[PDB]
């Protein structure tokens, strides 16, 4: 009831035609030699996309149904082939218990998509992949003749459909008429390397995760490796689990106190309030309050959740309609110069909404003022609520003088005036991130702590991968995070337990692959340089032994010593010897001999020989040259004009080559 799949599920990733190339790509593929489930009807889940194969001879498997909920309260799509035609239909079907082949649906309503095709043992295979509101279908056909299972082979799949459906697809179900069999496998995000022949089709492909040999093939970017020893990627441990930690905060933030306040101050006398110990759940504002302006500097609005803030201040005031564009970094005007100033390196969010009913009355509302005369501009986050008469020279005066005015000017708000002369309430929120203990924090759900293996962690918005260990550092009360010499985040404080945790990565140690050449065989040995296997190895082996260099898996340890063929290290060498196999030994220094020393005897030659010996020495190499303009820019004129500004690189390069 379960089988394996090998070299199944390769399709064209693009519409680019290329030939005689080895292209490398990374996306959702079915892994090589992976588990598939066989059926000879349940509700099979989707989870990322599906590889679906059907061995049949009498055409009994026809079409599918995809949908989140199989009731009629959701939206579902059927891809069915009746006796004469292929019809795709996305609607609100009430799915019967047995979708028998016609009459699968009892009724259909409120519906969006319909496609109807032209009038219409062996194996048919499909790949269904859903992303960005598009359902991609790939199809391949193979004339096989075996019956218990899926035959091992390499077959490519071609694109036929991408359907524009906005559907939650979490479940699917096949449709049967009434022998044959159908098999289901799950796609995963992996890296593959393909090969393109002269005609332009794909003939071979290799995974980069099943084997160390596959990792080496992807690294060197070839399908043929000579005899030797090669350094591959270090030993990786995949994360299995998740920990999410957040402080003990229950109550929500005072949205009604800040936004729905009875009155707001003037812009020259703006008011600042501290926000602390609350959960920023702004989705409760989706019913009453709506904002004409909302812009965030420093962070993304989508990342306003999943994140946890340190020191939040709210500044509130009232401006008129066309002054709201002055509440920004790097602006000039009457508000930005003399009333309210934002720093250049500002992290926060500015949000403003129109209040004409509550602030503008008939016959005027002259209660809001702004300053338009001042000796110099304001510093960031400063206010000046003084009221003294202003004279341009810089001398005190009296307001009935000629060069003596009042520095404040009244806003005039009426009910019947254009939007540029209407009241607007503005709130500026300021905060910093990843700097201090956090008291106002985002809405999430916490998870219990795991202290042994590699997990994804989320500590107050700090996201990463590693292992969590108990530590013994001494944090001051104002310190939340610690960093290393390379500014890695080594230590953290738990917001619930208040213990100190130490974070280190979960990949460690170098790996080498020893091969006798892919032409000779397809067997390899693996050397783990810093483990003691007398573990932290991966999948398997038959012979495991500990050299002075490290742990060797896949080789036989002989006792006799020969000359060195493939140098492993620390006195250990290895070769391919006779059914041939890889053997490892200690290298031989030379032929053993001895000569006796005596103080009254001497050895004298009585014959000679003439010997000629060859010695090869390199003398020269190839002379090369480069056109700097043709290599960098080609034939583009605009590139050449932009390249003229990079003076004295190409001359300095041609001079060296000459």
């Amino acid at each position: 009831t379960q089988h394996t799949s090998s070299m199944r599920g390769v399709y064209y990733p693009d519409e680019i035609f290329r030939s005689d190339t080895l292209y490398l790509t990374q996306d959702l593929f079915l892994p090589f030699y992976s588990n598939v489930t066989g059926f000879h009807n349940p509700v099979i889940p989707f989870k990322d996309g599906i590889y679906f194969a059907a061995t049949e001879k009498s055409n009994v498997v026809r079409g599918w149904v995809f949908g989140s909920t199989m009731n009629n309260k959701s939206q579902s799509v059927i891809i069915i082939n009746n006796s004469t035609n292929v019809v795709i239909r996305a609607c609100n079907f009430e799915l019967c218990d047995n979708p028998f082949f016609t009459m699968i649906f009892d009724n259909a309503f409120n519906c969006t998509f319909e496609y109807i095709s032209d009038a219409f043992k062996h194996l048919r295979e499909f790949v269904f992949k859903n992303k960005d509101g598009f359902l991609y279908v790939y199809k391949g056909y193979q004339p096989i003749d075996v019956v218990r299972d899926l035959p091992s082979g390499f077959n490519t799949l071609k694109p036929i459909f991408k359907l524009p459906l906005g559907i939650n697809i979490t479940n699917f179900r096949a449709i049967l008429t009434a022998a044959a069999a159908y098999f289901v496998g799950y796609l995963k995000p992996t890296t593959f390397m393909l090969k393109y022949d002269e005609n332009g089709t794909i003939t071979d492909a290799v995974d980069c995760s099943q084997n160390p040999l596959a990792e080496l093939k992807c690294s060197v970017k070839s399908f043929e490796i000579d005899k030797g020893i090669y350094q591959t990627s270090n030993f990786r441990v995949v994360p299995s689990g998740d920990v999410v930690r957040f402080p003990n905060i229950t109550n929500l933030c005072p949205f009604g106190e800040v936004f729905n306040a009875t009155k707001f101050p003037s812009v020259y006398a703006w008011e600042r309030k501290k926000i602390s110990n609350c959960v920023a759940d702004y989705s409760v504002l989706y019913n009453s309050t709506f904002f004409s302006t909302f812009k965030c500097y420093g962070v993304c609005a989508t990342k306003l959740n999943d994140l946890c803030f340190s020191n939040v201040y709210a500044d509130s005031f009232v401006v008129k309609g066309d002054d709201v564009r002055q509440i920004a970094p790097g602006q000039t005007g009457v508000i930005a110069d003399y009333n309210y100033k934002l720093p250049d390196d500002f992290m926060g969010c500015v949000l403003a909404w129109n209040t004409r009913n509550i602030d503008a009355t008939s016959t005027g509302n002259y209660n809001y003022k702004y300053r338009y005369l001042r000796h110099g501009k304001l510093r960031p986050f400063e206010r000046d609520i003084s009221n003294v008469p202003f004279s341009p020279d810089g001398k005190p005066c009296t307001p009935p003088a000629l060069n003596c005015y009042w520095p404040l000017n009244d806003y005039g708000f009426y009910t019947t005036t254009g939007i540029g002369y209407q009241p607007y309430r503005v709130v500026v929120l300021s905060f910093e991130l990843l700097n201090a203990p956090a008291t106002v924090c985002g809405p999430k759900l916490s998870t219990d702590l795991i202290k042994n293996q590699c997990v994804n962690f989320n500590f107050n918005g700090l996201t990463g991968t590693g292992v969590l260990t108990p530590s013994s550092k001494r944090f001051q009360p104002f310190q939340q995070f610690g960093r290393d010499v390379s500014d890695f985040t080594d230590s953290v404080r738990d917001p619930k337990t208040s213990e100190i945790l130490d974070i280190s990565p979960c990949s460690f140690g170098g790996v080498s692959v020893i091969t006798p050449g892919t032409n000779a065989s397809s067997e390899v040995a693996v050397l783990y340089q810093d483990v003691n296997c007398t573990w932290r190895i991966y999948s398997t082996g038959n012979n495991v032994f500990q050299t002075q260099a490290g742990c060797l898996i896949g080789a036989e340890h002989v006792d006799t010593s020969y000359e060195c063929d493939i140098p492993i290290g620390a006195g250990i060498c290895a070769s391919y010897h006779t059914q041939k196999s890889i053997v490892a030994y200690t290298m031989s220094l030379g032929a053993d001999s001895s000569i006796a020393y005596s103080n009254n005897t001497i050895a004298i030659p009585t014959n000679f020989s003439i010997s000629i010996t060859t010695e090869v020495m390199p003398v020269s190499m190839a002379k090369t040259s480069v056109d700097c303009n043709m290599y960098i820019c080609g034939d583009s004129t605009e590139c050449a004009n932009l390249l003229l500004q990079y003076g004295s690189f190409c001359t300095q390069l041609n001079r060296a080559l000459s």
């Binding site: 390379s486 890695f488 280190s504 002075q548 290290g569 103080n599």
Partner: protein, 295 residues
Amino acid sequence: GIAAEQDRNTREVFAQVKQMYKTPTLKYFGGFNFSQILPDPLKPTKRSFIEDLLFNKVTLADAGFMKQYGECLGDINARDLICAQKFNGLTVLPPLLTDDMIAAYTAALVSGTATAGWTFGAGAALQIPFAMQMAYRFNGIGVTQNVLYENQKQIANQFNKAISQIQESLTTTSTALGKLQDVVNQNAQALNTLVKQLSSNFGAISSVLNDILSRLCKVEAEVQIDRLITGRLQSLQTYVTQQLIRAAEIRASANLAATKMSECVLGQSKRVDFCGKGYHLMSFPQAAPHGVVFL
């Protein structure tokens, strides 16, 4: 390519004997005492006395080659450098020839010089009494054989006293092995710099990749991650270029050591100041960490 060149350097310097010779039980060859340059059988080490003295002087940066995960996962309270190097992807590989094999090679060379003379290097091992070999070498430098034979005893005494002087002067003086130790230090220094350059933000918003990915969108994080990637790639390229330049100088020195071993240990040289100051008689090789010492 650099690592393969290092192994070839060691092999070309030391493996110059076609066959290995057993050290004699008698270290006293006609008044010349060879006890301090040949291995001691009952002593646990298979190096000489002078080789032990040379190995003690170079404070070798202990390269591990067995640093398990639990050893670096523990001992966090001492911020060790090799643990940080291995955590950031930097690895040091062990040499092909261990120290014992090099000591065996030098013991075979000295044993061949004490018994066969100058003939095993340019042919087969032809044994000869040591005094007749010294007479031949005096004849080589322009002095008749009777000068050796008349006053052999005080010549042997001077030889033994000079060996004793060398052994004494390698127990106190520190700067003597200055060209080897510097090499070790240089490598370590470069590699340590490759860790500290991970703290530079390269004109991005932060040096930590997690914070950049955690508080920004896709398209805004692409620019910062690209700046970090470019900076770290060019830092690694600078490291590799410096290593490639240093390896050429090491190779030139190893070539000179190989030709000195070939022309002064296996023979007698008439080139002026090629092997010592004065008229050359013979030379003895001793092993050292990443190097050789000629007497």
